[PDB]
Design a protein around this ligand. Sequence first.
Ligand code: NAG
Ligand code: NA
Ligand code: NA
Ligand code: NA
Lengths: 31, 48, 494, 47
Amino acid sequence: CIAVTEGRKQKENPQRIYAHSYRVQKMCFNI
Amino acid sequence: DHFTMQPGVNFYTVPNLGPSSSSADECYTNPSFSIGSSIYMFSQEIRK
Amino acid sequence: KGEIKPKVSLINTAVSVSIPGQISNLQTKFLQKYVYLEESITKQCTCDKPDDDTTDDDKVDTTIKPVEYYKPDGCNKTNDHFTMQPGVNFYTVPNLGPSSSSADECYTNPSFSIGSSIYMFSQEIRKTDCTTGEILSIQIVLGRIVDKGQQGPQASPLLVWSVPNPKIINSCAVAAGDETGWVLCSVTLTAASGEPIPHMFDGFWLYKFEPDTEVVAYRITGFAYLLDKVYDSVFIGKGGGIQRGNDLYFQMFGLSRNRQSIKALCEHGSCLGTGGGGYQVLCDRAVMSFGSEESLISNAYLKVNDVASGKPTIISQTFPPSDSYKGSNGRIYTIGERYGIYLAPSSWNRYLRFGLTPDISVRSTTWLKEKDPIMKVLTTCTNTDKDMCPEICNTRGYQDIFPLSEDSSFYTYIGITPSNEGTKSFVAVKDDAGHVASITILPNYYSITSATISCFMYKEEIWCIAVTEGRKQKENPQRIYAHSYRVQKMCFNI
Amino acid sequence: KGEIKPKVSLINTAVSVSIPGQISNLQTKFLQKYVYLEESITKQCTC
Ligand SMILES: *[C@@H]1O[C@H](CO)[C@@H](O)[C@H](O)[C@H]1NC(C)=O
Ligand code: NA
Ligand code: NA
Ligand code: NA
């Protein structure tokens, strides 16, 4: 999955747009 | 059995999705992002 | 302007950075699989990344990372000596910055800095003579260190820029942080005719460079800076500077006016000769400029505050004459959680001047007791190396060191020795016990006059790149060259 | 002639020289490793 966000890296920086990627994993727990 | 899906541990970066600028009086706002079969569309507004 | 240029920049970035990284990753995986196959073959036949998490996830390129000092683990239990020694080879690092074949032009005063994954480079082009020649241009390069198919690391320039109004600039330097480069330049007072008044002070200029963006210029003058002493002229140390947090740190030197008593630092070993207190008088006069006690040449820490806000300000701290010799070019280093300063030799002491401070303060700086790098070129001084006799002389040269340990007990440097024709140069590593491991370098080249070293982590080892200035042949004009070497650890047992 | 031309020259150098050398070095290393693998197979799984 890819996520697009707004934000500022530093407190006094102007707003910008960033993008990051992550993986969703199947799991099978046993209780 | 409990079938579950969980988020992965790393949050990688995707550099250069769209062009940016170093000006300090411009704000990039209101992105619109969509992914198709093989292509992606991205939209942004610059406001002063 | 709208279509061709951004796409050309994208093509340059993709062919110079991305594809080499992809191929290097493929090769690394191939070798790993081969090793695994060999191990399985030997074993069977008869007769996921939490450490990389929050570490390399935010990095665009993972070729290099900041240095991580070697540890004596394993070496310790048997009586043993743990030592670091230089690699045998000194590979070229071609096209670090653009060059020219003009014979009237000299490339001088290089400034080199390495960030997290980017590098910043600066050079001056002066007509005719290197020292007192008109500044034709000042060129800045921002790039990345990448792994091509060659043995050593390589450099890929990403942005080349020319400083506006080069004539009115006294001197300046560069610093590198993650995805960011900074250039601090000092200007002089120009008035009346357009020709600048040499060796004056009129403020600073600060330039910020980021990848695939436009350079940002800030003017620091008037009430935006507060130096602790009245400086007639201000120069920025060619070594460079560093960024910590929202603040930058540089070294400066220049003419400063004072009215107090002067007792210049006088450390030397059994000079004898005349003596009788005349050495103290010579030491006091050396730091003076043109004899008058009013004006001295002073060294100073320089601090730039709130760079992210958009209104940077500058403060400074001046070294007293009792704790220093005459001002010269310097460099600021971050070692571990503490910082260091290297001061080049100008005047009679020609030993190495390195100091360690935890908070970048004048009153909390302690100097190393090591003499290993001794400048023997570009000096008019006549005192012997064994004992440094106070004398009035000028030395113009730059050879810095890179600490390889938290307390700077290990370090690497480059030594240059004058000869009948040109100079002879070697690269050396200095350990705790007092031993030097040396390898001669650049045999073909005629002469080398300076060297600056910066080290990093590359392929699970410490690699260093040295930027020197010199002449390949006797009649060629002076140019600047970059080469790479590795530092390898050893556990010798006696 | 201030920006575009040097970048074009750099791209030409990158595509004509560096990348072919990297790919050739990869192939050379791969062939050497295959030779070593065959030698070790013959030496060890001979039985
Ligand atoms: C300790 O050093 C001595 C010589 O100084 C050497 O002969 C001896 O082998 C060393 N100890 C070991 C077990 O390495
Ligand atoms: Na394999
Ligand atoms: Na193989
Ligand atoms: Na193979």
